[PDB]
Amino acid sequence: LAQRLEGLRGYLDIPQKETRLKELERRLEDPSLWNDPEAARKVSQEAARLRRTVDTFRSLESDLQGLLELMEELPAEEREALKPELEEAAKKLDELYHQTLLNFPHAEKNAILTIQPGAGGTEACDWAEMLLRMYTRFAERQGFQVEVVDLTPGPEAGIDYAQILVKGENAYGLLSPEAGVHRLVRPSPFDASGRRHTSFAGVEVIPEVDEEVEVVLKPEELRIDVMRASGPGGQGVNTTDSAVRVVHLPTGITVTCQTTRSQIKNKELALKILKARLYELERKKREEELKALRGEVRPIEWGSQIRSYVLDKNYVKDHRTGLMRHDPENVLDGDLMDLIWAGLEWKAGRR
Amino acid sequence: MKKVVAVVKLQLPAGKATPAPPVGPALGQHGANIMEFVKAFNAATANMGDAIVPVEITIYADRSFTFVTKTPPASYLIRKAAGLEKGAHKPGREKVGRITWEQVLEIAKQKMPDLNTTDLEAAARMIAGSARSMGVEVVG
RNA sequence: GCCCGGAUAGCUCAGUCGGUAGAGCAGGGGAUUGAAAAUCCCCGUGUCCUUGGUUCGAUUCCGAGUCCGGGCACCA
RNA sequence: CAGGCCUUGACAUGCUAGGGAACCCGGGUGAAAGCCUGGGGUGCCCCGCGAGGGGAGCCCUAGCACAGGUGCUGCAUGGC
Ligand SMILES: [Mg+2]
Ligand SMILES: [Mg+2]
Ligand SMILES: [Mg+2]
Ligand SMILES: [Mg+2]
Ligand SMILES: [Mg+2]
Ligand SMILES: [Mg+2]
Ligand SMILES: [Mg+2]
Ligand SMILES: [Mg+2]
Ligand SMILES: [Mg+2]
Ligand SMILES: [Mg+2]
Ligand SMILES: [Mg+2]
C-alpha cells in the first residue's frame, strides 16, 4: 500500500495546475503578447512547466494500471514477472520524491545541527545527548559523514551544547524538516521518586553557505578632503593641508585624522579605520541577515514541540502531521526517513 | 520547405500532438487552429510510424494549409543505425554511436526524394555529413 | 612608518653553554559517592612563529618576514 | 538478520460442499521448506447378496466462524 499514499501525493497537483496550463498555453497561441521582451519569456517558462506536469501524470497512471492487472500474490509466471516491471517503475516513483526534497533554495551543501537543551534541566540536557546520537546514526546510515564542531557536558547529567557538521549529497534537505524543539516523557533517572518527567531541547539546522573572508573597498566610492590642520602647529599648521577626511557614500560613514603632521600618513591611517568600522557594520548585517533565514521556532517552553518522543507508553507523537508512531526506542537509532517523509510535506506544503 | 508570406516549418512529434508544449500554439501566432491540426493531422503521423515527422505548415488565413509531409531529418535517422539518442553535446572524433559502410545505405532506402539526386549513392554521401555533425562514427 | 621586547603542551608561562625539552590548569583510564564535586592513584602531552644561512647537528646563533605589546613622531 | 516458500494456516472449535470418509510405498524437483505426484482401498449404518450409498472413524481441497504474536504497556494486574 506504500504507493497508494505516494501515488496520490501527486494526484492533487493535477487539477490545481491542470486548468492553469489552459490560461497559459492560450497566451502562446497569440503573438500580440510577445511584444513584451519579458512577459513573453515568463510565459514561456510556464509554457515549459507542462514538462514536469505532463510526463508524470502520464507515466504514473501506467504504473497504476500495468500492475493492478496481472498481480497474483501467489507465486506465478505472468505475475512475479510483472513486479520487476514495476520495481524500477516504483523505484522511479522516487523522481517525484526528490522533487519535494531537492526543490529547497539551499538543500545541496552540508547541514549544521545545533542541539541545545532547555526545560527539564539536568534531564533536558540528557535529552539532547540522545537526540544527538539519534541524528548521528541517521546521517551515518544514509552514507553522510560527520564533523563534531563542538560538544560540552556540564553539572549533573546530559550535555550543555553540541554543534556538528554533516556532509553527503542532498543533506540539508533531509535535516531541514527536523527543525524545532523536541519533547520527551520518561521516568526521570535524576529524581528520587522516579516520577514521570518531561524535557525540552531544540534542534537547529542551517546549511554551510558563504565561507570566505574578504572586503575590498576600492577607493572607488571614497571622497577624500584635506583641510588645514587644527589646534597647535606653527608657521606650518596654518600652511599645510595636513588634516584629511575620507568619506564613504553608500553608507554615510566619515573618518578623519590629524594625529600626525602629514596628509599622506593621515589619509591611509584614516582609511585604516573606515576599513574597521565597516567590517563591523558590514558584519552587523550578517548577524541580522542570517537570524531570519534560520526561522523563529526555538522557545523550548512547554507548548511548542514539533515532535514529541515518549519512552513511557512507548510511541512517538509527530505533532506537525497528526501521525503517531509506536516505535520511540526505534527512532533514537537514526530511523527518521518516515517522520521526514511527512516532514518534507507539512513544511514544504504551504509555500 | 514550401512557400512564403505566411508559412512555418517544424518537425512535429509522432503519435500524439494537440496541446501547446512542442509547438501546439506556435503555429497559431502566425494563424492556426486547434481542431484542424490534432486529430485531422495524425493521419500522416499514424503512417510515418513514430519518432519524428519533419512535416511542416503553410498559412492562408482561413484554416487552410499545405501539410506537405517529409522524411525524418538525417539527424534522427542516424540514431537508428547507430543507436544513440542525442548524438553528442559536441561532435568531432568521439561519439556514442557507430555506422558501418553500408550502414549509410540502410538510409539509402529512406532518403531518395528531395535530396537532389534520385540515386542512393549520390545522395548517401550527404548523410555521411550528418555523421560529422552529431559525431556518430563511420565504421571504416 | 622609528627603535626595543615577544611568540615554548590544548590555556597561561618557566628553559638550553647549541646536542634534554618543562611546569600549573585543562583533558584521558581507574578509586572512593547512591550520584555529581572535592579528593585519590595511573598517563598522553611540541614540525619550540614564518623562513633562509652558520654548523658535525640550531628550539637556541644569525639576515628578512607575519603578528602582538611598549617608548618616539619634536622647532616651526 | 539475509535469502526461498505458506496461507484457515503449526494448534483449538463449530460448520459448509460434489469430494470424502481408518488407508499405504514412492516418483520428480529444490539448499531445505515447499510446489507437484505414481498406487493399495475404507470394519460399515447396512433397503441390502447386487447397481447404490445411508455409512462411523474420519484424511484429502475449497469456503465460513475464527486461530496466531517472546509485538507494547510490570506505573493498567494475578502469582511467584
Ligand atoms: Mg559548574
Ligand atoms: Mg608648539
Ligand atoms: Mg606649507
Ligand atoms: Mg600558547
Ligand atoms: Mg634533539
Ligand atoms: Mg607537569
Ligand atoms: Mg576520572
Ligand atoms: Mg566527577
Ligand atoms: Mg610529551
Ligand atoms: Mg623654539
Ligand atoms: Mg511492580
UniProtKB/Swiss-Prot annotation, chain A:
One Gene Ontology cellular component: cytoplasm
Keyword line: Cytoplasm, Methylation, Protein biosynthesis, RNA-binding, rRNA-binding, tRNA-binding
Localization: Cytoplasm
N5-methylglutamine PTM sites in chain numbering: 235
Superkingdom per UniProt: Bacteria
A Pfam family this chain is assigned to: RF-1
InterPro entries: PCRF, Pep_chain_release_fac_I, Pep_chain_release_fac_I_sf, PrfB
GO molecular function list: rRNA binding; translation release factor activity, codon specific; tRNA binding
Function recorded in the entry: Peptide chain release factor 2 directs the termination of translation in response to the peptide chain termination codons UGA and UAA. In endogenous ribosomes interacts with P-site tRNA and 23S rRNA. In the presence of truncated mRNA in the 70S ribosome, ArfA and RF2 interact such that the GGQ peptide hydrolysis motif of RF2 rises into the peptidyl-transferase center and releases the ribosome. Recruited to stalled E.coli 70S ribosomes by E.coli ArfA, but cannot be functionally accomodated in the peptidyl-transferase center. Note T.thermophilus probably does not encode arfA.
Record text on subunit structure and interactions: Interacts with the ribosome. Interacts with ribosomal protein L11. Recruited to stalled E.coli ribosomes by E.coli ArfA.
HAMAP family: Rel_fac_2
Family statement drawn from the similarity comment of this UniProt entry: Belongs to the prokaryotic/mitochondrial release factor family.
Protein name listed in UniProt: Peptide chain release factor RF2
Species per Swiss-Prot/TrEMBL record: Thermus thermophilus (strain ATCC 27634 / DSM 579 / HB8)
Curated annotation (Swiss-Prot), chain B:
PROSITE patterns assigned: RIBOSOMAL_L11
Subunit structure: Part of the ribosomal stalk of the 50S ribosomal subunit. Interacts with L10 and the large rRNA to form the base of the stalk. L10 forms an elongated spine to which 3 L12 dimers bind in a sequential fashion forming a heptameric L10(L12)2(L12)2(L12)2 complex. Contacts one of the L7 dimers. Interacts with RF2 (release factor 2).
Pfam families recorded: Ribosomal_L11, Ribosomal_L11_N
Keyword annotations of the record: Methylation, Ribonucleoprotein, Ribosomal protein, RNA-binding, rRNA-binding
Protein name, as recorded: Large ribosomal subunit protein uL11
Source species of the chain: Thermus thermophilus (strain ATCC 27634 / DSM 579 / HB8)
Biological process terms in GO annotation: translation
Modification N,N,N-trimethylmethionine occurs at: 1
GO MF term (any one): structural constituent of ribosome
Family: Belongs to the universal ribosomal protein uL11 family.
Purpose: Forms part of the ribosomal stalk which helps the ribosome interact with GTP-bound translation factors. The stalk extends beyond the surface of the 70S ribosome and is preferentially stabilized in 70S versus 50S crystals. In the 70S ribosome is in a position where it could interact transiently with the A site tRNA during translation.
N6,N6,N6-trimethyllysine: residues bearing it: 3, 39, 70
UniProt superkingdom: Bacteria
PTM (free text): The protein probably contains twelve methyl groups; at least one lysine residue (Lys-3) is known to be trimethylated. Methylation of the protein is not required for function.
GO cellular component entries: cytosolic large ribosomal subunit
Cited InterPro entries: Ribosomal_uL11, Ribosomal_uL11_bac-typ, Ribosomal_uL11_C, Ribosomal_uL11_C_sf, Ribosomal_uL11_CS, Ribosomal_uL11_N, Ribosomal_uL11_N_sf
